[PDB]
Symmetry: C3
């Protein structure tokens, strides 16, 4: 099983800031889900036109895919840990949007 | 209970046009789904390499996620209403692609908490 | 029915390279799934910040959605990856997602199925 985190935001990040974010956010996913960082895939797209709640204020949309291992308990801890990274980096917690989505391919073969 | 709309297109929009698109498209989703505009999330990515039907002509790809409130009936009106915005803004109706994806409250996060 | 392929990668493609990729990748999807090339939708986003397995080396993320298998999944995984390994990518840096949907959860030309 290998988790995936897809992030879209209207904030502007530098090339270094994006590199640190995918590292820090990927490590958060590794901790909450109990998987090694080797199995973690992180995608970050900045400068995206976003409107959340009628406003185009700084916001982020996130999707967390993982074959299994997602439950009411884990989703709440992942929501809190992922959101704090953003609230610690200039974001507002009410502008952060997370979807959990638990049939996968890797190196040309399925599992 | 909050819907999400993710839009990818190869057209080039100005910053003002992108702001207008997310507002108009967001209000379309609010009307069709029966939610206030406060709960609507809209994402618009322009200038993405798109090929639909072998051609890289002007096209758009769309995904609509919503905690519940997604049914065979609603999806049909949402498909029609969203397409009309594009056909009214320089797109051709046969180049528009929509995917509907309902999810649960436990599988959704907001303000560091689920539902 | 109608397949959809959404690709995210941190590699930098030229405008011509992107056009060739969506054609070649689109044709691979049409062949493996047994559907005409007319119903295939391909999206390619380059220059996306990607970190896979802790490393930000060249990588690609893929999602393949289709209304409604073990046979295709093996062929689609292998055929799509081979395109990338033939274009400077590493096969263990290629990430594919299969997402079957229902007829009522798909839209085209303002109507569902
Ligand atoms: Cl920079
Ligand atoms: Cl812990
Ligand atoms: Cl996406
Ligand atoms: Cl501009
Ligand atoms: Cl160029």
């Amino acid at each position: 099983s290998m988790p995936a985190l897809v992030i879209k935001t209207n904030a502007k990040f530098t090339e270094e800031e994006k590199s640190k974010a995918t590292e820090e956010l990927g490590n958060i996913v590794s901790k909450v889900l109990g998987k090694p960082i080797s199995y973690v895939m992180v995608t970050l797209e900045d400068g995206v036109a976003v409107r959340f709640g009628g406003s185009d204020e700084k916001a982020a949309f996130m999707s967390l895919m993982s074959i299994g291992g997602l439950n009411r308990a884990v989703n709440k801890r992942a929501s809190a840990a992922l959101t704090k990274w953003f609230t610690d980096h200039g974001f507002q917690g009410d502008r952060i949007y997370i979807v959990f989505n638990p049939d996968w391919g890797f190196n040309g073969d399925t599992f």
